[PDB]
Nucleic acid binder design. Structure first.
Ligand SMILES: [K+]
Ligand SMILES: [K+]
Ligand SMILES: [Mg+2]
Ligand SMILES: [Mg+2]
Ligand SMILES: [Mg+2]
Ligand SMILES: [Mg+2]
Ligand SMILES: [Mg+2]
Ligand SMILES: [Mg+2]
Ligand SMILES: [Mg+2]
Ligand SMILES: [Mg+2]
Ligand SMILES: [Mg+2]
Ligand SMILES: [Mg+2]
Ligand SMILES: [Mg+2]
Ligand SMILES: [Mg+2]
Ligand SMILES: [Mg+2]
Ligand SMILES: [Mg+2]
Ligand SMILES: [Mg+2]
Ligand SMILES: [Mg+2]
Ligand SMILES: [Mg+2]
Ligand SMILES: [Mg+2]
Ligand SMILES: [Mg+2]
Ligand SMILES: [Mg+2]
Ligand SMILES: [Mg+2]
Ligand SMILES: [Mg+2]
Ligand SMILES: [Mg+2]
Ligand SMILES: [Mg+2]
Ligand SMILES: [Mg+2]
Ligand SMILES: [Mg+2]
Ligand SMILES: [Mg+2]
Ligand SMILES: [Mg+2]
Ligand SMILES: [Mg+2]
Ligand SMILES: [Mg+2]
Ligand SMILES: [Mg+2]
Ligand SMILES: [Mg+2]
Ligand SMILES: [Mg+2]
Ligand SMILES: [Mg+2]
Ligand SMILES: [Mg+2]
Ligand SMILES: [Mg+2]
Ligand SMILES: [Mg+2]
Ligand SMILES: [Mg+2]
Ligand SMILES: [Mg+2]
Ligand SMILES: [Mg+2]
Ligand SMILES: [Mg+2]
Ligand SMILES: [Mg+2]
Ligand SMILES: [Mg+2]
Ligand SMILES: [Mg+2]
Ligand SMILES: [Mg+2]
Ligand SMILES: [Mg+2]
Ligand SMILES: [Mg+2]
Ligand SMILES: [Mg+2]
Ligand SMILES: [Mg+2]
Ligand SMILES: [Mg+2]
Ligand SMILES: [Mg+2]
Ligand SMILES: [Mg+2]
Ligand SMILES: [Mg+2]
Ligand SMILES: [Mg+2]
Ligand SMILES: [Mg+2]
Ligand SMILES: [Mg+2]
Ligand SMILES: [Mg+2]
Ligand SMILES: [Mg+2]
Ligand SMILES: [Mg+2]
Ligand SMILES: [Mg+2]
Ligand SMILES: [Mg+2]
Ligand SMILES: [Mg+2]
Ligand SMILES: [Mg+2]
Ligand SMILES: [Mg+2]
Ligand SMILES: [Mg+2]
Ligand SMILES: [Mg+2]
Ligand SMILES: [Mg+2]
Ligand SMILES: [Mg+2]
Ligand SMILES: [Mg+2]
Ligand SMILES: [Mg+2]
Ligand SMILES: [Mg+2]
Lengths: 119, 149, 207, 126, 50
RNA sequence: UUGACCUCAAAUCAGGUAGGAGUACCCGCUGAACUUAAGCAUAUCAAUAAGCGGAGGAAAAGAAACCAACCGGGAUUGCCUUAGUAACGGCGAGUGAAGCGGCAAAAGCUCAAAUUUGAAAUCUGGUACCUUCGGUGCCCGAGUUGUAAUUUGGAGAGGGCAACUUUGGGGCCGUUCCUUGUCUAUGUUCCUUGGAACAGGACGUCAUAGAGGGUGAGAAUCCCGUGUGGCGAGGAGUGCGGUUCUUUGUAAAGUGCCUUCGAAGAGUCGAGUUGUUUGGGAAUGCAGCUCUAAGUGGGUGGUAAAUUCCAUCUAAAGCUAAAUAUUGGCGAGAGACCGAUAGCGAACAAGUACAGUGAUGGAAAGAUGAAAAGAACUUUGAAAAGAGAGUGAAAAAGUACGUGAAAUUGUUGAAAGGGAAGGGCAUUUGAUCAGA
RNA sequence: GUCGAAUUUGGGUAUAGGGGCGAAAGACUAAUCGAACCAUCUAGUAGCUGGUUCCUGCCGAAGUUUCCCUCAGGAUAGCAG
RNA sequence: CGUGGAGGUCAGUGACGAAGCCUAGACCGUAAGGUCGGGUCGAACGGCCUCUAGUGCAGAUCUUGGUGGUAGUAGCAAAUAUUCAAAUGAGAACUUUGAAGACUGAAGUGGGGAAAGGUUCCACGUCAACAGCAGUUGGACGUGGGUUAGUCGAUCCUAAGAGAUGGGGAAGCUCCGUUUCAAAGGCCUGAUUUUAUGCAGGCCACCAUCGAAAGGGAAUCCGGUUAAGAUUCCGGAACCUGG
RNA sequence: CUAUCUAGCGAAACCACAGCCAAGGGAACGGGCUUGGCAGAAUCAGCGGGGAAAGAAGACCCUGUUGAGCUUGACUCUAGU
RNA sequence: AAACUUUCAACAACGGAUCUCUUGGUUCUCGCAUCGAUGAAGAACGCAGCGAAAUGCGAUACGUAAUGUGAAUUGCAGAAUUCCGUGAAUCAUCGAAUCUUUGAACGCACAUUGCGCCCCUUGGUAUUCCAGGGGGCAUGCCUGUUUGAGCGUCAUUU
């Protein structure tokens, strides 16, 4: 029924590479068989297993690189958050919350008060 | 095209006027939206009457100087005579207008009087106290109506 | 659509080609080429005098004239002959106008609201509804107007203490605050004599 | 009699939503009422039909016939019941498409998820 | 021209692969408003225009 | 000989940014003509179409070098008015604002010009660590040709006197909002018709649910939903209510009096001229060229100029939410709209097929049946098909498929007919038929 | 007619619309030329031509006056409802 | 009078048959029209009081679609020309084979190519449509197969010319200009070899790029082979470039 | 070689309705109307008298307060100089 | 008298009107603000057991990963029914990836699937040649870094 990503995540990158090689060999033999046998659908399962193995390999490699770049500024661009271009160009929360000393003093001295009418 | 005895008409429709025709189908929708916005603004701000206290003011243009109406904001002189600073009045919901000047003692006295009434009829919540809910009234203008002398 | 029928570069062929001088789609190779365009008489052309949104839709009525009409409809609700002539099967009914106890305003359940209406004699009108329901004739039936039915009693109250919700599921039955009486409900189809069931509080607040 | 502004009474929108409903929504659309005995036993009225449910046809030409669902043909908005079939002239048998609203479930195919669904809907005894 | 650019040969290959009638198992699908291949092209009737 | 500085370079130097798309609405530039004037050139169309540059969720404008002339109003924007008015115009055709007033929404502000001079107190970057929209330490560098604090005209600053009053940022739980999930009522009771009951009748039930849709015909009660509530899940933020350590700080801010001051924007205002534009008319704005200010000054005060006053603001620097717009995008709810020659060109593999070198042009085309149950089998024929048989409620539904008009056509039946036919009045004859 | 040089011709290339190109015909410029084609302004304007969709009832004309850059039009008076 | 839609009403009509359609059948109205019977048909529709309009067709060389008379008519007559038998086939003037008679007559009706086309090439099956007769045949229909290169071309060069950069113009889309008012560069190597490197001995540039399948140009021939590929495959025999 | 006839195949132009004349009158040259002459199915090949035959909203002429190409000390401008 | 012509009716044709349908259009209102050098819009070419298109996707190709639901998909074939389960599905959701050749398009070019340069690595003795794999080389501008030029210019040595 194909490979499972949660089973592949328990394996090392060497085991994943060897499983990918075996899956490629199996797919090659299956497409050789497809020339004679009509309507052979196992090649779809083998293709999806290859895709899953490659996905898990890429996941492990990218997690290792994320750990290598943890905490430090200038992460790789494909590892940075993909918001929109305008959102990534927008001022951070620290900026546009920056205020001058005069403005901070006056907004501390005279904040918007809470007041109710009672008549 | 000058036919029988009719008044001379001046219908200015020789431009592409059909490209700019605003039919206010959204009159009722915009009224509902304005009422909704007023409700959310009242809920968002603390108990507070949805508008600032406005001064009494004489209209220019003798066609209208016989009547009195709400102005933009109290003058600095009126605020000082009422015992407040402009910044504090702006933070306790009094509109302040640095442009207007006082040359009429009647209007100045009326504005100082309504400022004092507003101060005696509002409760300013402490910054770091308890201040139990004070039953927000929505209209300072309705609470302090403008009276024609 | 303001561009409907005019999304073409069609031009008149002019005279000398034994065809009408209507503008014709140019080009070739598709069948649309050479066809008439831009004419109200042309297939796929623009309709004559295309409908415009700035048509007058709402009609201004003098407020006093509107109140005159509402007062006339209210008065017509008291005339049993008009109520009978407007459908409104009030034959084995007590005096018109029909005033019921203010307890009706506090009814919360549709079951007891219907029971009270039947007790006060609106059962024949309630049965006229739920039996007059018929599929609407014509294209309106697939324009969110699929079904038509007769109008039942208009229950008028002074304070809504649940009667509106208790009666809103009863077919044909309408509820109205006495402070705001609707002419469209008091004289449906411009026909005087709506069968109105007043509560005591609404009847006293009419003055 | 609808009150919320999020639901539409538009017949065109309702028909489009029904006819373009995905498979997961068609599972709900293809619910069937429980029989009287199962309604008494579980305390719920209707359930989405499942492939191994046992049903009794209560409407149509096949009224009174019983059997086990063979497939929930969600694409056709119909279910196929075993031994409820049409015999073609050539001797073959083809399943009769039935709508679950015209059946009653006489025996539920139960598993952990079905039992959890019973309890979530407020049913008793798994 | 028998001396053709690869781009031309690639478009030629795509046209060759899509020059086929409608598959016969289509027209058996549930709704299947499709009756025939309405985009069939022939060299004797309509030119590819590159 | 070395080390600077200034300016200018180079590097696949370290880190970033711009392009393009969309473009309904928005900010500018550029810019017609058809048209109207019953001709036509000014005018009009129109400060529009087309072309070009540039943003956002709105944009722009915006806290007066304003309006006014009043007992004075007081940022901007939008609506109702002003007003088809003042005014412009071969004063022809036409065009055409603004003040006030009512309302919607309301919000205010900050730089330059000041010596911190007893202390560049300011900031980017690199690096290490950390509690990572950032912080701390260190080190280059930027910067005195001026980066911080202090002040923005409403003021305000430097000194002296007197005291009083006020206050800073994060967690936790709720709340607000957004995106979602799930649960929550009542007949498939009987009779008739029907292929099918969802029809009619009888008896019932729920209704804060009788909106809508589906199911073999008009279904509240068969199903999904609907109505009313309940229970969750993931996020945005602190809008705001408790919770507790952070307690900032002999720091910051406000207030009165006396005194000395009070810096406030230049090829800019303004003027001449030219062109364009405006309702702006001895010149409304704009722009080119020439001239070119002042500081009790300058601008405006809708008739050019001189003289004397007065009134009102403070340009040549800057930010700002809402009310406003929205034939684009996304998500919804609707209609006295159209019902396949209609409605978008496109209900369908439609901007598709197809045409053109190209820019571009651009269709036609929906419906068997409840369900294929899509006609097993026999027979004639080479076959297509026919005749049967059969399925189906119906084949007068056979995929050349709901109904199935007319033009036009075949067969049958009837009738008439010497170079038209058709028609009107009247009756004979034949056919047919209502009423009593 | 001409047929060995002002020759014929392929391909590449250049010149684009009030522009090109022309041993010159207003010729050619993709069957388009005394101003190409395409889209938009544009449903351009037309005193001019054609058409302008049910019934019945009642009443019922004018082609004449004056003026017009007017003479195939309009205004005006008259006739009519 | 009639039509589409809307409010009210007749608790109107209807799968025991709505609407529609056909009907030298009947009734009513002067008429617009209305009503009924019969047939067909299958899911909605009508009377009345009002509301509303994209509301009534014979025309517009009207628009779209469909259909006639003409009419089984005009005609299917240029390119010398066909005939006999057999096979196949349901069916042969047209397919195949054989025989005969002819033509293109090497400036071809032959054998290859350039542009263009794009699978039309070839095989098998096969004739509903197309091949203006026919068809068993086909450039048709359906399914498949087929195009093999160091040496043949492209690729490289420059031609007329096109066109960035540096600069200048233009509100701008973009225009000029092609070595120009530019600080426009890497390949040789002593030394560096704390590293054959930057510094630092020492030599050279009035310049991107695109532009030819007929111009220039490194190098391949013969024989055989397929249903369809051949200077490409196979066998043999060479050559050129780079290392 | 057609035309002709046959097998197969099979359009188009045009068409208010259609198609015998004479005279009359009539929009002043009728296929229809009036008065006469007359007049018998269904047709084939030719033919060019007629259908004021067809092909095209006359290109000539005139009108339009409709254009355009071109010219000129028309009016008003304009690049350039 | 037939044939022929014409009129009407029935049935059958032609044709697709009418009627009734409608997952579409059109208009109005409400709510929201989110494309792109972290490579957009658009284009080319490919991808399924059997697909030409539409739709989806990119050599991980009608798709992978994750989450939810809870037993399908369906035209046939195939697989499975443990399906009381980290588990069907052409399901929904969607935060992790892949994302060919392109395209503002970025080594130079492009009517060429043309031609380079640099780094690491692998093979052919191989730093130089050839080839395979991986990663890079556009322009303008800003801040900073480094290396520089100029009697533009200061100080010092002189
Ligand atoms: K001309
Ligand atoms: K709609
Ligand atoms: Mg249309
Ligand atoms: Mg109808
Ligand atoms: Mg770099
Ligand atoms: Mg841009
Ligand atoms: Mg116009
Ligand atoms: Mg004019
Ligand atoms: Mg005119
Ligand atoms: Mg003119
Ligand atoms: Mg524009
Ligand atoms: Mg944006
Ligand atoms: Mg807004
Ligand atoms: Mg702004
Ligand atoms: Mg100011
Ligand atoms: Mg103002
Ligand atoms: Mg007025
Ligand atoms: Mg104007
Ligand atoms: Mg201060
Ligand atoms: Mg329910
Ligand atoms: Mg139904
Ligand atoms: Mg200033
Ligand atoms: Mg201009
Ligand atoms: Mg601004
Ligand atoms: Mg259409
Ligand atoms: Mg049809
Ligand atoms: Mg039938
Ligand atoms: Mg047919
Ligand atoms: Mg039919
Ligand atoms: Mg007929
Ligand atoms: Mg005869
Ligand atoms: Mg001449
Ligand atoms: Mg018109
Ligand atoms: Mg009379
Ligand atoms: Mg005159
Ligand atoms: Mg005339
Ligand atoms: Mg209509
Ligand atoms: Mg009927
Ligand atoms: Mg008839
Ligand atoms: Mg039906
Ligand atoms: Mg009409
Ligand atoms: Mg007609
Ligand atoms: Mg007519
Ligand atoms: Mg016609
Ligand atoms: Mg026609
Ligand atoms: Mg013939
Ligand atoms: Mg001939
Ligand atoms: Mg011949
Ligand atoms: Mg022959
Ligand atoms: Mg032979
Ligand atoms: Mg010869
Ligand atoms: Mg010979
Ligand atoms: Mg062949
Ligand atoms: Mg033939
Ligand atoms: Mg044949
Ligand atoms: Mg073939
Ligand atoms: Mg060669
Ligand atoms: Mg250039
Ligand atoms: Mg080249
Ligand atoms: Mg060569
Ligand atoms: Mg060959
Ligand atoms: Mg060899
Ligand atoms: Mg005669
Ligand atoms: Mg005569
Ligand atoms: Mg005649
Ligand atoms: Mg006669
Ligand atoms: Mg002849
Ligand atoms: Mg003749
Ligand atoms: Mg004419
Ligand atoms: Mg003419
Ligand atoms: Mg005239
Ligand atoms: Mg002219
Ligand atoms: Mg990509």
């Amino acid at each position: 029924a194909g490979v499972k990503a949660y089973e592949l995540r328990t394996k090392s990158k060497e085991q994943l590479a060897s499983q990918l090689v075996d899956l490629k060999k199996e797919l090659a033999e299956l497409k050789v068989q497809k020339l004679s046998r009509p309507s052979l659908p196992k090649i779809k399962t083998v293709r999806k297993s290859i895709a899953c193995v490659l996905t898990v390999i890429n996941e492990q490699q990218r997690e290792a690189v994320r750990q290598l770049y943890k905490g430090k500024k200038y992460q790789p661009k494909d590892l940075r958050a993909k918001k929109t271009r305008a959102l990534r160009r927008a001022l951070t929360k620290f900026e546009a919350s920056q205020v001058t000393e005069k403005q901070r003093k006056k907004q501390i001295a005279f904040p918007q008060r809470k007041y109710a009418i009672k008549a | 095209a000058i036919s029988k005895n009719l008044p001379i008409l001046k219908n200015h429709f020789r431009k592409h006027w059909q490209e700019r025709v605003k039919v206010h189908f959204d009159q009722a929708g915009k009224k509902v939206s304005r009422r909704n916005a007023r409700a959310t603004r009242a809920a968002k701000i603390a108990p507070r009457p949805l508008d600032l206290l406005r001064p009494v003011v004489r209209a220019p243009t003798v066609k209208y100087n016989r009547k009195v109406r709400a102005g933009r904001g109290f003058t600095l002189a009126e605020v000082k005579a009422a015992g407040l600073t402009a910044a504090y009045a702006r933070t306790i919901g009094i509109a302040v207008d640095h442009r207007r000047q006082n040359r009429n003692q009647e209007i100045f006295d009326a504005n100082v009087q309504r400022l004092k009434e507003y101060q005696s009829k509002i409760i300013v919540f402490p910054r770091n106290g308890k201040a139990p809910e004070a039953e927000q009234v929505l209209s300072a203008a309705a609470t302090f109506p403008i009276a024609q002398p | 659509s303001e561009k409907a029928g005019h999304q073409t570069s069609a031009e008149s062929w002019g005279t000398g080609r034994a065809v009408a001088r209507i503008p014709r789609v140019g080009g070739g190779g598709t069948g649309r080429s050479g066809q008439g365009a831009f004419g109200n008489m042309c297939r796929g052309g623009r309709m004559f005098a295309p409908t415009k949104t700035w048509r007058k839709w709402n009609v201004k009525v003098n407020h006093n004239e509107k109140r005159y009409a509402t007062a006339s409809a209210i008065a017509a609700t008291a005339v049993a002959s008009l109520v009978l002539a407007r459908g409104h099967r009030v034959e084995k009914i007590p005096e018109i106008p029909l005033v019921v106890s203010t307890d009706l305003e506090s009814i919360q359940k549709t079951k007891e609201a219907v029971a009270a209406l039947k007790a006060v004699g609106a059962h024949s009108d309630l049965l006229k509804v739920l039996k007059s329901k018929k599929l609407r004739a014509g294209k309106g039936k697939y324009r969110n107007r699929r079904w038509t039915q007769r109008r039942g009693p208009l229950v008028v109250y002074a304070e809504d203490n649940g009667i509106v919700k208790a009666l809103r599921n009863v077919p044909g039955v309408e509820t109205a605050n006495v402070a705001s009486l609707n002419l469209l409900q008091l004289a449906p189809g411009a026909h005087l004599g709506r069968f109105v069931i007043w509560t005591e509080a609404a009847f006293t607040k009419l003055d | 009699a609808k009150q919320s502004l999020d639901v539409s009474s538009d017949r065109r929108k309702a028909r489009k939503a029904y006819f373009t409903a995905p498979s997961s929504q068609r599972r709900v659309l293809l619910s069937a009422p429980l029989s009287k005995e199962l309604r008494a036993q579980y305390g719920i009225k209707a359930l989405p039909i499942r492939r191994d449910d046992e049903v009794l046809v209560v409407r149509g030409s096949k009224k009174g016939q019983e059997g086990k669902i063979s497939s929930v043909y969600r694409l056709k908005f119909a279910v196929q019941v075993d031994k409820v079939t049409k015999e073609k002239v050539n001797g073959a048998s083809v399943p009769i498409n039935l709508h679950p609203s015209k059946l009653v479930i006489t025996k539920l195919h139960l598993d952990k998820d079905r039992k959890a669904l019973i309890q979530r809907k407020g049913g008793k005894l798994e | 021209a028998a001396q053709k650019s690869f781009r031309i040969k690639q478009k030629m290959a795509k046209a060759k692969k899509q020059n086929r009638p409608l598959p016969q198992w289509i027209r058996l699908r549930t709704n299947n408003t499709i009756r025939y291949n309405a985009k069939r092209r022939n060299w004797r009737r309509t030119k590819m225009n590159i």
